[PDB]
Design a protein around this motif. Structure first.
Motif, short mmCIF file in Angstrom:
data_model
loop_
_atom_site.label_atom_id
_atom_site.label_comp_id
_atom_site.label_asym_id
_atom_site.label_seq_id
_atom_site.Cartn_x
_atom_site.Cartn_y
_atom_site.Cartn_z
N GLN A 46 -4.06 7.37 8.15
CA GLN A 46 -3.04 7.92 7.29
C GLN A 46 -3.55 7.94 5.87
OE1 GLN A 46 1.12 6.25 5.35
NE2 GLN A 46 0.64 5.70 7.44
N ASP A 47 -3.30 9.00 5.18
CA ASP A 47 -3.71 9.08 3.80
C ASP A 47 -2.54 8.69 2.94
OD1 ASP A 47 -2.81 12.09 4.44
OD2 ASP A 47 -2.76 11.92 2.27
N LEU A 48 -2.79 7.91 1.95
CA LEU A 48 -1.75 7.39 1.10
C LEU A 48 -2.24 7.40 -0.33
CD1 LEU A 48 0.97 5.83 1.00
CD2 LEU A 48 -0.36 3.73 1.30
N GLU A 49 -1.34 7.48 -1.28
CA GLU A 49 -1.71 7.39 -2.67
C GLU A 49 -1.02 6.25 -3.34
OE1 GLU A 49 -1.46 11.93 -3.28
OE2 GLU A 49 -2.72 11.26 -4.92
N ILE A 50 -1.74 5.62 -4.22
CA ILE A 50 -1.25 4.51 -4.97
C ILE A 50 -1.58 4.78 -6.40
CG2 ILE A 50 -1.35 2.01 -5.34
CD1 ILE A 50 -2.33 1.66 -2.55
N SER A 51 -0.71 4.44 -7.26
CA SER A 51 -0.92 4.69 -8.65
C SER A 51 -1.66 3.53 -9.27
CB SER A 51 0.41 4.94 -9.33
OG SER A 51 1.11 6.03 -8.71
#
Length: 61
Positions: A46-51
């Protein structure tokens, strides 16, 4: 960003690391992308983004 460099470092070696966030959440993921704002990671395909602002530090190298 200081920690940004660390995510970049992990991405350079295609390392899976533990990312510690503001919510106290520790996610162990593989670094996909590092921009000066956020980081894209990979968890179980799964691709996820985190700031970056929400990232505190990296462990689990």
């Amino acid at each position: 960003s200081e920690v940004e460099t660390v995510l970049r470092k992990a991405a350079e070696r295609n390392k899976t690391v533990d990312i510690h966030t503001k919510s106290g959440t520790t996610v162990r993921v593989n670094v996909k992308r590092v921009d000066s704002k956020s980081v894209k990671v990979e968890r179980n395909g799964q691709d996820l983004e985190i700031s970056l602002d929400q990232i505190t530090h990296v462990d689990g190298w």
